[PDB]
């Protein structure tokens, strides 16, 4: 469907000129304001003259995003605008990603935040795999989006390993392979060295350390199925525990 903007159930007919460009957030992703209501959204622009490889990837991801309306852990699309020269994809405006939150924090991200993040990411990967046969496998702090409402969603679409590395980086503030100078050197350390587990002297719960250890299983045959990973006590704890991610997000973004 094209030519419509749906923000919270209210459906509006709209064209690209009904949006005011508030600047690049960076492909190109704009922050735009819907003049009719004042709502602010994220808009991804795909140029018809663009690279064939980049456009093909954009259209594949949009196909999944349009089918993922029933997953609360995937960034939602509000509508599309097709012009003679461009395609404008209206997405819900998130705050920032976990990589930038780590940079503003200038230190480890608390376990209670990573607990809610873990529950959101795993259920997004399981949804993508179960409902659409998509194997993401490329989870990193730059793909995990958060907003001031406390929401945690995936964007920009074997998977268990990259989640474990992302959790170790965010829990320690240190990327486990920061001293590798090439991509091949990273692959050698992944295969030759023991998995980079969580430190034991940072007050991490046994559930958190167990979950990261299960994610960083080198033998692919020994990695758990999703129905097993969704039963891990670390997932069970933060499925129900009250964690004020929204207030923590605002406090971190208030840092200079
Ligand atoms: C880690 C955070 C960061 O540095 N960036 C770069 C600038 C844009 C930021 N950002 N991206 C989105 C977004 C992207 N997509 C998307 C849609 C399709 Br269809 C295909 C591929 C992608 O990546 N949806 N949403 C952002 C949103 N929605 N809000 C705020 N910032 C966003 C990420």
mmCIF file with all atom_site columns, N, CA, C and O in Angstrom, residues 145-195:
data_model
loop_
_atom_site.group_PDB
_atom_site.id
_atom_site.type_symbol
_atom_site.label_atom_id
_atom_site.label_alt_id
_atom_site.label_comp_id
_atom_site.label_asym_id
_atom_site.label_entity_id
_atom_site.label_seq_id
_atom_site.pdbx_PDB_ins_code
_atom_site.Cartn_x
_atom_site.Cartn_y
_atom_site.Cartn_z
_atom_site.occupancy
_atom_site.B_iso_or_equiv
_atom_site.pdbx_formal_charge
_atom_site.auth_seq_id
_atom_site.auth_comp_id
_atom_site.auth_asym_id
_atom_site.auth_atom_id
_atom_site.pdbx_PDB_model_num
ATOM 1   N N  . UNK A 1 145 ? 17.730 -0.691  18.326 1.00 0.00 ? 145 UNK A N  1
ATOM 2   C CA . UNK A 1 145 ? 17.221 0.662   18.493 1.00 0.00 ? 145 UNK A CA 1
ATOM 3   C C  . UNK A 1 145 ? 16.386 0.772   19.763 1.00 0.00 ? 145 UNK A C  1
ATOM 4   O O  . UNK A 1 145 ? 15.662 -0.159  20.129 1.00 0.00 ? 145 UNK A O  1
ATOM 5   N N  . UNK A 1 146 ? 16.498 1.917   20.433 1.00 0.00 ? 146 UNK A N  1
ATOM 6   C CA . UNK A 1 146 ? 15.718 2.230   21.620 1.00 0.00 ? 146 UNK A CA 1
ATOM 7   C C  . UNK A 1 146 ? 15.150 3.637   21.481 1.00 0.00 ? 146 UNK A C  1
ATOM 8   O O  . UNK A 1 146 ? 15.693 4.474   20.757 1.00 0.00 ? 146 UNK A O  1
ATOM 9   N N  . UNK A 1 147 ? 14.042 3.893   22.177 1.00 0.00 ? 147 UNK A N  1
ATOM 10  C CA . UNK A 1 147 ? 13.422 5.212   22.190 1.00 0.00 ? 147 UNK A CA 1
ATOM 11  C C  . UNK A 1 147 ? 13.150 5.635   23.629 1.00 0.00 ? 147 UNK A C  1
ATOM 12  O O  . UNK A 1 147 ? 13.351 4.870   24.576 1.00 0.00 ? 147 UNK A O  1
ATOM 13  N N  . UNK A 1 148 ? 12.680 6.875   23.785 1.00 0.00 ? 148 UNK A N  1
ATOM 14  C CA . UNK A 1 148 ? 12.430 7.423   25.113 1.00 0.00 ? 148 UNK A CA 1
ATOM 15  C C  . UNK A 1 148 ? 11.241 6.776   25.811 1.00 0.00 ? 148 UNK A C  1
ATOM 16  O O  . UNK A 1 148 ? 11.034 7.030   27.002 1.00 0.00 ? 148 UNK A O  1
ATOM 17  N N  . UNK A 1 149 ? 10.462 5.956   25.112 1.00 0.00 ? 149 UNK A N  1
ATOM 18  C CA . UNK A 1 149 ? 9.360  5.228   25.725 1.00 0.00 ? 149 UNK A CA 1
ATOM 19  C C  . UNK A 1 149 ? 9.793  3.891   26.312 1.00 0.00 ? 149 UNK A C  1
ATOM 20  O O  . UNK A 1 149 ? 8.957  3.178   26.876 1.00 0.00 ? 149 UNK A O  1
ATOM 21  N N  . UNK A 1 150 ? 11.071 3.536   26.192 1.00 0.00 ? 150 UNK A N  1
ATOM 22  C CA . UNK A 1 150 ? 11.562 2.270   26.688 1.00 0.00 ? 150 UNK A CA 1
ATOM 23  C C  . UNK A 1 150 ? 11.482 1.123   25.707 1.00 0.00 ? 150 UNK A C  1
ATOM 24  O O  . UNK A 1 150 ? 11.832 -0.007  26.073 1.00 0.00 ? 150 UNK A O  1
ATOM 25  N N  . UNK A 1 151 ? 11.034 1.370   24.479 1.00 0.00 ? 151 UNK A N  1
ATOM 26  C CA . UNK A 1 151 ? 10.944 0.308   23.489 1.00 0.00 ? 151 UNK A CA 1
ATOM 27  C C  . UNK A 1 151 ? 12.329 -0.105  23.008 1.00 0.00 ? 151 UNK A C  1
ATOM 28  O O  . UNK A 1 151 ? 13.258 0.703   22.942 1.00 0.00 ? 151 UNK A O  1
ATOM 29  N N  . UNK A 1 152 ? 12.458 -1.385  22.672 1.00 0.00 ? 152 UNK A N  1
ATOM 30  C CA . UNK A 1 152 ? 13.688 -1.952  22.130 1.00 0.00 ? 152 UNK A CA 1
ATOM 31  C C  . UNK A 1 152 ? 13.305 -2.777  20.911 1.00 0.00 ? 152 UNK A C  1
ATOM 32  O O  . UNK A 1 152 ? 12.539 -3.741  21.029 1.00 0.00 ? 152 UNK A O  1
ATOM 33  N N  . UNK A 1 153 ? 13.818 -2.395  19.742 1.00 0.00 ? 153 UNK A N  1
ATOM 34  C CA . UNK A 1 153 ? 13.427 -3.035  18.495 1.00 0.00 ? 153 UNK A CA 1
ATOM 35  C C  . UNK A 1 153 ? 14.651 -3.279  17.626 1.00 0.00 ? 153 UNK A C  1
ATOM 36  O O  . UNK A 1 153 ? 15.677 -2.607  17.750 1.00 0.00 ? 153 UNK A O  1
ATOM 37  N N  . UNK A 1 154 ? 14.520 -4.258  16.737 1.00 0.00 ? 154 UNK A N  1
ATOM 38  C CA . UNK A 1 154 ? 15.542 -4.568  15.749 1.00 0.00 ? 154 UNK A CA 1
ATOM 39  C C  . UNK A 1 154 ? 15.302 -3.779  14.467 1.00 0.00 ? 154 UNK A C  1
ATOM 40  O O  . UNK A 1 154 ? 14.167 -3.429  14.136 1.00 0.00 ? 154 UNK A O  1
ATOM 41  N N  . UNK A 1 155 ? 16.385 -3.512  13.739 1.00 0.00 ? 155 UNK A N  1
ATOM 42  C CA . UNK A 1 155 ? 16.277 -2.879  12.432 1.00 0.00 ? 155 UNK A CA 1
ATOM 43  C C  . UNK A 1 155 ? 17.375 -3.408  11.520 1.00 0.00 ? 155 UNK A C  1
ATOM 44  O O  . UNK A 1 155 ? 18.366 -3.983  11.978 1.00 0.00 ? 155 UNK A O  1
ATOM 45  N N  . UNK A 1 156 ? 17.175 -3.202  10.215 1.00 0.00 ? 156 UNK A N  1
ATOM 46  C CA . UNK A 1 156 ? 18.159 -3.542  9.192  1.00 0.00 ? 156 UNK A CA 1
ATOM 47  C C  . UNK A 1 156 ? 18.506 -5.029  9.237  1.00 0.00 ? 156 UNK A C  1
ATOM 48  O O  . UNK A 1 156 ? 19.475 -5.439  9.886  1.00 0.00 ? 156 UNK A O  1
ATOM 49  N N  . UNK A 1 157 ? 17.708 -5.841  8.549  1.00 0.00 ? 157 UNK A N  1
ATOM 50  C CA . UNK A 1 157 ? 17.900 -7.287  8.527  1.00 0.00 ? 157 UNK A CA 1
ATOM 51  C C  . UNK A 1 157 ? 18.773 -7.696  7.345  1.00 0.00 ? 157 UNK A C  1
ATOM 52  O O  . UNK A 1 157 ? 19.046 -6.890  6.453  1.00 0.00 ? 157 UNK A O  1
ATOM 53  N N  . UNK A 1 158 ? 23.151 -19.550 14.162 1.00 0.00 ? 158 UNK A N  1
ATOM 54  C CA . UNK A 1 158 ? 24.183 -18.618 13.723 1.00 0.00 ? 158 UNK A CA 1
ATOM 55  C C  . UNK A 1 158 ? 23.934 -17.231 14.304 1.00 0.00 ? 158 UNK A C  1
ATOM 56  O O  . UNK A 1 158 ? 24.876 -16.505 14.634 1.00 0.00 ? 158 UNK A O  1
ATOM 57  N N  . UNK A 1 159 ? 22.654 -16.872 14.428 1.00 0.00 ? 159 UNK A N  1
ATOM 58  C CA . UNK A 1 159 ? 22.299 -15.563 14.966 1.00 0.00 ? 159 UNK A CA 1
ATOM 59  C C  . UNK A 1 159 ? 22.674 -15.438 16.434 1.00 0.00 ? 159 UNK A C  1
ATOM 60  O O  . UNK A 1 159 ? 22.924 -14.328 16.919 1.00 0.00 ? 159 UNK A O  1
ATOM 61  N N  . UNK A 1 160 ? 22.732 -16.562 17.152 1.00 0.00 ? 160 UNK A N  1
ATOM 62  C CA . UNK A 1 160 ? 22.931 -16.508 18.595 1.00 0.00 ? 160 UNK A CA 1
ATOM 63  C C  . UNK A 1 160 ? 24.331 -16.011 18.934 1.00 0.00 ? 160 UNK A C  1
ATOM 64  O O  . UNK A 1 160 ? 24.537 -15.388 19.982 1.00 0.00 ? 160 UNK A O  1
ATOM 65  N N  . UNK A 1 161 ? 25.306 -16.254 18.055 1.00 0.00 ? 161 UNK A N  1
ATOM 66  C CA . UNK A 1 161 ? 26.686 -15.863 18.338 1.00 0.00 ? 161 UNK A CA 1
ATOM 67  C C  . UNK A 1 161 ? 26.845 -14.348 18.368 1.00 0.00 ? 161 UNK A C  1
ATOM 68  O O  . UNK A 1 161 ? 27.448 -13.796 19.296 1.00 0.00 ? 161 UNK A O  1
ATOM 69  N N  . UNK A 1 162 ? 26.332 -13.658 17.346 1.00 0.00 ? 162 UNK A N  1
ATOM 70  C CA . UNK A 1 162 ? 26.489 -12.209 17.285 1.00 0.00 ? 162 UNK A CA 1
ATOM 71  C C  . UNK A 1 162 ? 25.756 -11.519 18.427 1.00 0.00 ? 162 UNK A C  1
ATOM 72  O O  . UNK A 1 162 ? 26.178 -10.447 18.875 1.00 0.00 ? 162 UNK A O  1
ATOM 73  N N  . UNK A 1 163 ? 24.665 -12.116 18.910 1.00 0.00 ? 163 UNK A N  1
ATOM 74  C CA . UNK A 1 163 ? 23.980 -11.564 20.073 1.00 0.00 ? 163 UNK A CA 1
ATOM 75  C C  . UNK A 1 163 ? 24.841 -11.686 21.324 1.00 0.00 ? 163 UNK A C  1
ATOM 76  O O  . UNK A 1 163 ? 24.885 -10.764 22.147 1.00 0.00 ? 163 UNK A O  1
ATOM 77  N N  . UNK A 1 164 ? 25.534 -12.815 21.481 1.00 0.00 ? 164 UNK A N  1
ATOM 78  C CA . UNK A 1 164 ? 26.418 -12.974 22.624 1.00 0.00 ? 164 UNK A CA 1
ATOM 79  C C  . UNK A 1 164 ? 27.578 -11.997 22.602 1.00 0.00 ? 164 UNK A C  1
ATOM 80  O O  . UNK A 1 164 ? 27.957 -11.449 23.640 1.00 0.00 ? 164 UNK A O  1
ATOM 81  N N  . UNK A 1 165 ? 28.156 -11.764 21.421 1.00 0.00 ? 165 UNK A N  1
ATOM 82  C CA . UNK A 1 165 ? 29.238 -10.792 21.299 1.00 0.00 ? 165 UNK A CA 1
ATOM 83  C C  . UNK A 1 165 ? 28.730 -9.387  21.596 1.00 0.00 ? 165 UNK A C  1
ATOM 84  O O  . UNK A 1 165 ? 29.414 -8.589  22.249 1.00 0.00 ? 165 UNK A O  1
ATOM 85  N N  . UNK A 1 166 ? 27.526 -9.062  21.122 1.00 0.00 ? 166 UNK A N  1
ATOM 86  C CA . UNK A 1 166 ? 26.947 -7.752  21.403 1.00 0.00 ? 166 UNK A CA 1
ATOM 87  C C  . UNK A 1 166 ? 26.704 -7.566  22.895 1.00 0.00 ? 166 UNK A C  1
ATOM 88  O O  . UNK A 1 166 ? 26.908 -6.471  23.433 1.00 0.00 ? 166 UNK A O  1
ATOM 89  N N  . UNK A 1 167 ? 26.269 -8.626  23.580 1.00 0.00 ? 167 UNK A N  1
ATOM 90  C CA . UNK A 1 167 ? 26.006 -8.523  25.012 1.00 0.00 ? 167 UNK A CA 1
ATOM 91  C C  . UNK A 1 167 ? 27.295 -8.334  25.801 1.00 0.00 ? 167 UNK A C  1
ATOM 92  O O  . UNK A 1 167 ? 27.331 -7.559  26.763 1.00 0.00 ? 167 UNK A O  1
ATOM 93  N N  . UNK A 1 168 ? 28.363 -9.032  25.409 1.00 0.00 ? 168 UNK A N  1
ATOM 94  C CA . UNK A 1 168 ? 29.646 -8.871  26.087 1.00 0.00 ? 168 UNK A CA 1
ATOM 95  C C  . UNK A 1 168 ? 30.182 -7.460  25.885 1.00 0.00 ? 168 UNK A C  1
ATOM 96  O O  . UNK A 1 168 ? 30.692 -6.833  26.822 1.00 0.00 ? 168 UNK A O  1
ATOM 97  N N  . UNK A 1 169 ? 30.070 -6.935  24.663 1.00 0.00 ? 169 UNK A N  1
ATOM 98  C CA . UNK A 1 169 ? 30.549 -5.583  24.390 1.00 0.00 ? 169 UNK A CA 1
ATOM 99  C C  . UNK A 1 169 ? 29.780 -4.553  25.207 1.00 0.00 ? 169 UNK A C  1
ATOM 100 O O  . UNK A 1 169 ? 30.374 -3.651  25.809 1.00 0.00 ? 169 UNK A O  1
ATOM 101 N N  . UNK A 1 170 ? 28.451 -4.673  25.244 1.00 0.00 ? 170 UNK A N  1
ATOM 102 C CA . UNK A 1 170 ? 27.650 -3.700  25.978 1.00 0.00 ? 170 UNK A CA 1
ATOM 103 C C  . UNK A 1 170 ? 27.776 -3.877  27.487 1.00 0.00 ? 170 UNK A C  1
ATOM 104 O O  . UNK A 1 170 ? 27.675 -2.895  28.232 1.00 0.00 ? 170 UNK A O  1
ATOM 105 N N  . UNK A 1 171 ? 27.998 -5.107  27.961 1.00 0.00 ? 171 UNK A N  1
ATOM 106 C CA . UNK A 1 171 ? 28.082 -5.327  29.402 1.00 0.00 ? 171 UNK A CA 1
ATOM 107 C C  . UNK A 1 171 ? 29.421 -4.877  29.968 1.00 0.00 ? 171 UNK A C  1
ATOM 108 O O  . UNK A 1 171 ? 29.499 -4.499  31.143 1.00 0.00 ? 171 UNK A O  1
ATOM 109 N N  . UNK A 1 172 ? 30.481 -4.921  29.163 1.00 0.00 ? 172 UNK A N  1
ATOM 110 C CA . UNK A 1 172 ? 31.807 -4.511  29.608 1.00 0.00 ? 172 UNK A CA 1
ATOM 111 C C  . UNK A 1 172 ? 32.224 -3.146  29.083 1.00 0.00 ? 172 UNK A C  1
ATOM 112 O O  . UNK A 1 172 ? 33.173 -2.560  29.615 1.00 0.00 ? 172 UNK A O  1
ATOM 113 N N  . UNK A 1 173 ? 31.540 -2.629  28.064 1.00 0.00 ? 173 UNK A N  1
ATOM 114 C CA . UNK A 1 173 ? 31.988 -1.423  27.398 1.00 0.00 ? 173 UNK A CA 1
ATOM 115 C C  . UNK A 1 173 ? 33.180 -1.616  26.490 1.00 0.00 ? 173 UNK A C  1
ATOM 116 O O  . UNK A 1 173 ? 33.742 -0.627  26.010 1.00 0.00 ? 173 UNK A O  1
ATOM 117 N N  . UNK A 1 174 ? 33.580 -2.862  26.238 1.00 0.00 ? 174 UNK A N  1
ATOM 118 C CA . UNK A 1 174 ? 34.759 -3.181  25.441 1.00 0.00 ? 174 UNK A CA 1
ATOM 119 C C  . UNK A 1 174 ? 34.381 -4.211  24.389 1.00 0.00 ? 174 UNK A C  1
ATOM 120 O O  . UNK A 1 174 ? 33.895 -5.296  24.726 1.00 0.00 ? 174 UNK A O  1
ATOM 121 N N  . UNK A 1 175 ? 34.604 -3.874  23.128 1.00 0.00 ? 175 UNK A N  1
ATOM 122 C CA . UNK A 1 175 ? 34.396 -4.821  22.036 1.00 0.00 ? 175 UNK A CA 1
ATOM 123 C C  . UNK A 1 175 ? 35.409 -5.939  22.142 1.00 0.00 ? 175 UNK A C  1
ATOM 124 O O  . UNK A 1 175 ? 36.624 -5.665  22.196 1.00 0.00 ? 175 UNK A O  1
ATOM 125 N N  . UNK A 1 176 ? 35.004 -7.212  22.197 1.00 0.00 ? 176 UNK A N  1
ATOM 126 C CA . UNK A 1 176 ? 35.954 -8.304  22.442 1.00 0.00 ? 176 UNK A CA 1
ATOM 127 C C  . UNK A 1 176 ? 37.058 -8.426  21.401 1.00 0.00 ? 176 UNK A C  1
ATOM 128 O O  . UNK A 1 176 ? 38.112 -8.994  21.706 1.00 0.00 ? 176 UNK A O  1
ATOM 129 N N  . UNK A 1 177 ? 36.857 -7.922  20.188 1.00 0.00 ? 177 UNK A N  1
ATOM 130 C CA . UNK A 1 177 ? 37.838 -8.037  19.116 1.00 0.00 ? 177 UNK A CA 1
ATOM 131 C C  . UNK A 1 177 ? 38.314 -6.664  18.655 1.00 0.00 ? 177 UNK A C  1
ATOM 132 O O  . UNK A 1 177 ? 38.549 -6.432  17.467 1.00 0.00 ? 177 UNK A O  1
ATOM 133 N N  . UNK A 1 178 ? 38.479 -5.737  19.602 1.00 0.00 ? 178 UNK A N  1
ATOM 134 C CA . UNK A 1 178 ? 38.860 -4.370  19.261 1.00 0.00 ? 178 UNK A CA 1
ATOM 135 C C  . UNK A 1 178 ? 40.305 -4.264  18.792 1.00 0.00 ? 178 UNK A C  1
ATOM 136 O O  . UNK A 1 178 ? 40.645 -3.308  18.085 1.00 0.00 ? 178 UNK A O  1
ATOM 137 N N  . UNK A 1 179 ? 41.160 -5.213  19.162 1.00 0.00 ? 179 UNK A N  1
ATOM 138 C CA . UNK A 1 179 ? 42.568 -5.166  18.791 1.00 0.00 ? 179 UNK A CA 1
ATOM 139 C C  . UNK A 1 179 ? 42.872 -5.897  17.490 1.00 0.00 ? 179 UNK A C  1
ATOM 140 O O  . UNK A 1 179 ? 44.040 -5.957  17.091 1.00 0.00 ? 179 UNK A O  1
ATOM 141 N N  . UNK A 1 180 ? 41.864 -6.452  16.824 1.00 0.00 ? 180 UNK A N  1
ATOM 142 C CA . UNK A 1 180 ? 42.069 -7.089  15.531 1.00 0.00 ? 180 UNK A CA 1
ATOM 143 C C  . UNK A 1 180 ? 42.076 -6.033  14.431 1.00 0.00 ? 180 UNK A C  1
ATOM 144 O O  . UNK A 1 180 ? 41.198 -5.166  14.385 1.00 0.00 ? 180 UNK A O  1
ATOM 145 N N  . UNK A 1 181 ? 43.069 -6.106  13.545 1.00 0.00 ? 181 UNK A N  1
ATOM 146 C CA . UNK A 1 181 ? 43.240 -5.086  12.520 1.00 0.00 ? 181 UNK A CA 1
ATOM 147 C C  . UNK A 1 181 ? 42.536 -5.420  11.210 1.00 0.00 ? 181 UNK A C  1
ATOM 148 O O  . UNK A 1 181 ? 42.280 -4.508  10.413 1.00 0.00 ? 181 UNK A O  1
ATOM 149 N N  . UNK A 1 182 ? 42.215 -6.690  10.966 1.00 0.00 ? 182 UNK A N  1
ATOM 150 C CA . UNK A 1 182 ? 41.520 -7.097  9.754  1.00 0.00 ? 182 UNK A CA 1
ATOM 151 C C  . UNK A 1 182 ? 40.351 -8.006  10.108 1.00 0.00 ? 182 UNK A C  1
ATOM 152 O O  . UNK A 1 182 ? 40.253 -8.525  11.223 1.00 0.00 ? 182 UNK A O  1
ATOM 153 N N  . UNK A 1 183 ? 39.457 -8.193  9.134  1.00 0.00 ? 183 UNK A N  1
ATOM 154 C CA . UNK A 1 183 ? 38.300 -9.055  9.353  1.00 0.00 ? 183 UNK A CA 1
ATOM 155 C C  . UNK A 1 183 ? 38.710 -10.518 9.457  1.00 0.00 ? 183 UNK A C  1
ATOM 156 O O  . UNK A 1 183 ? 38.098 -11.289 10.206 1.00 0.00 ? 183 UNK A O  1
ATOM 157 N N  . UNK A 1 184 ? 39.740 -10.923 8.710  1.00 0.00 ? 184 UNK A N  1
ATOM 158 C CA . UNK A 1 184 ? 40.188 -12.309 8.776  1.00 0.00 ? 184 UNK A CA 1
ATOM 159 C C  . UNK A 1 184 ? 40.805 -12.618 10.132 1.00 0.00 ? 184 UNK A C  1
ATOM 160 O O  . UNK A 1 184 ? 40.658 -13.732 10.648 1.00 0.00 ? 184 UNK A O  1
ATOM 161 N N  . UNK A 1 185 ? 41.487 -11.639 10.732 1.00 0.00 ? 185 UNK A N  1
ATOM 162 C CA . UNK A 1 185 ? 42.056 -11.851 12.056 1.00 0.00 ? 185 UNK A CA 1
ATOM 163 C C  . UNK A 1 185 ? 40.970 -12.097 13.091 1.00 0.00 ? 185 UNK A C  1
ATOM 164 O O  . UNK A 1 185 ? 41.178 -12.870 14.033 1.00 0.00 ? 185 UNK A O  1
ATOM 165 N N  . UNK A 1 186 ? 39.807 -11.460 12.929 1.00 0.00 ? 186 UNK A N  1
ATOM 166 C CA . UNK A 1 186 ? 38.685 -11.726 13.822 1.00 0.00 ? 186 UNK A CA 1
ATOM 167 C C  . UNK A 1 186 ? 38.234 -13.172 13.682 1.00 0.00 ? 186 UNK A C  1
ATOM 168 O O  . UNK A 1 186 ? 37.958 -13.852 14.677 1.00 0.00 ? 186 UNK A O  1
ATOM 169 N N  . UNK A 1 187 ? 38.157 -13.667 12.443 1.00 0.00 ? 187 UNK A N  1
ATOM 170 C CA . UNK A 1 187 ? 37.712 -15.038 12.221 1.00 0.00 ? 187 UNK A CA 1
ATOM 171 C C  . UNK A 1 187 ? 38.693 -16.039 12.817 1.00 0.00 ? 187 UNK A C  1
ATOM 172 O O  . UNK A 1 187 ? 38.283 -17.080 13.345 1.00 0.00 ? 187 UNK A O  1
ATOM 173 N N  . UNK A 1 188 ? 39.994 -15.741 12.750 1.00 0.00 ? 188 UNK A N  1
ATOM 174 C CA . UNK A 1 188 ? 40.982 -16.636 13.344 1.00 0.00 ? 188 UNK A CA 1
ATOM 175 C C  . UNK A 1 188 ? 40.830 -16.699 14.858 1.00 0.00 ? 188 UNK A C  1
ATOM 176 O O  . UNK A 1 188 ? 40.937 -17.778 15.451 1.00 0.00 ? 188 UNK A O  1
ATOM 177 N N  . UNK A 1 189 ? 40.578 -15.557 15.501 1.00 0.00 ? 189 UNK A N  1
ATOM 178 C CA . UNK A 1 189 ? 40.423 -15.556 16.952 1.00 0.00 ? 189 UNK A CA 1
ATOM 179 C C  . UNK A 1 189 ? 39.123 -16.232 17.373 1.00 0.00 ? 189 UNK A C  1
ATOM 180 O O  . UNK A 1 189 ? 39.069 -16.882 18.423 1.00 0.00 ? 189 UNK A O  1
ATOM 181 N N  . UNK A 1 190 ? 38.066 -16.091 16.570 1.00 0.00 ? 190 UNK A N  1
ATOM 182 C CA . UNK A 1 190 ? 36.808 -16.764 16.881 1.00 0.00 ? 190 UNK A CA 1
ATOM 183 C C  . UNK A 1 190 ? 36.999 -18.277 16.872 1.00 0.00 ? 190 UNK A C  1
ATOM 184 O O  . UNK A 1 190 ? 36.465 -18.992 17.730 1.00 0.00 ? 190 UNK A O  1
ATOM 185 N N  . UNK A 1 191 ? 37.790 -18.783 15.925 1.00 0.00 ? 191 UNK A N  1
ATOM 186 C CA . UNK A 1 191 ? 37.999 -20.217 15.773 1.00 0.00 ? 191 UNK A CA 1
ATOM 187 C C  . UNK A 1 191 ? 39.107 -20.763 16.660 1.00 0.00 ? 191 UNK A C  1
ATOM 188 O O  . UNK A 1 191 ? 39.007 -21.905 17.125 1.00 0.00 ? 191 UNK A O  1
ATOM 189 N N  . UNK A 1 192 ? 40.157 -19.981 16.908 1.00 0.00 ? 192 UNK A N  1
ATOM 190 C CA . UNK A 1 192 ? 41.306 -20.497 17.642 1.00 0.00 ? 192 UNK A CA 1
ATOM 191 C C  . UNK A 1 192 ? 41.222 -20.263 19.144 1.00 0.00 ? 192 UNK A C  1
ATOM 192 O O  . UNK A 1 192 ? 41.750 -21.072 19.915 1.00 0.00 ? 192 UNK A O  1
ATOM 193 N N  . UNK A 1 193 ? 40.588 -19.183 19.584 1.00 0.00 ? 193 UNK A N  1
ATOM 194 C CA . UNK A 1 193 ? 40.560 -18.834 20.996 1.00 0.00 ? 193 UNK A CA 1
ATOM 195 C C  . UNK A 1 193 ? 39.251 -19.272 21.643 1.00 0.00 ? 193 UNK A C  1
ATOM 196 O O  . UNK A 1 193 ? 38.258 -19.558 20.969 1.00 0.00 ? 193 UNK A O  1
ATOM 197 N N  . UNK A 1 194 ? 39.267 -19.327 22.972 1.00 0.00 ? 194 UNK A N  1
ATOM 198 C CA . UNK A 1 194 ? 38.058 -19.623 23.720 1.00 0.00 ? 194 UNK A CA 1
ATOM 199 C C  . UNK A 1 194 ? 37.068 -18.464 23.600 1.00 0.00 ? 194 UNK A C  1
ATOM 200 O O  . UNK A 1 194 ? 37.467 -17.318 23.382 1.00 0.00 ? 194 UNK A O  1
ATOM 201 N N  . UNK A 1 195 ? 35.771 -18.740 23.724 1.00 0.00 ? 195 UNK A N  1
ATOM 202 C CA . UNK A 1 195 ? 34.768 -17.673 23.596 1.00 0.00 ? 195 UNK A CA 1
ATOM 203 C C  . UNK A 1 195 ? 34.977 -16.594 24.643 1.00 0.00 ? 195 UNK A C  1
ATOM 204 O O  . UNK A 1 195 ? 35.341 -16.889 25.791 1.00 0.00 ? 195 UNK A O  1
#
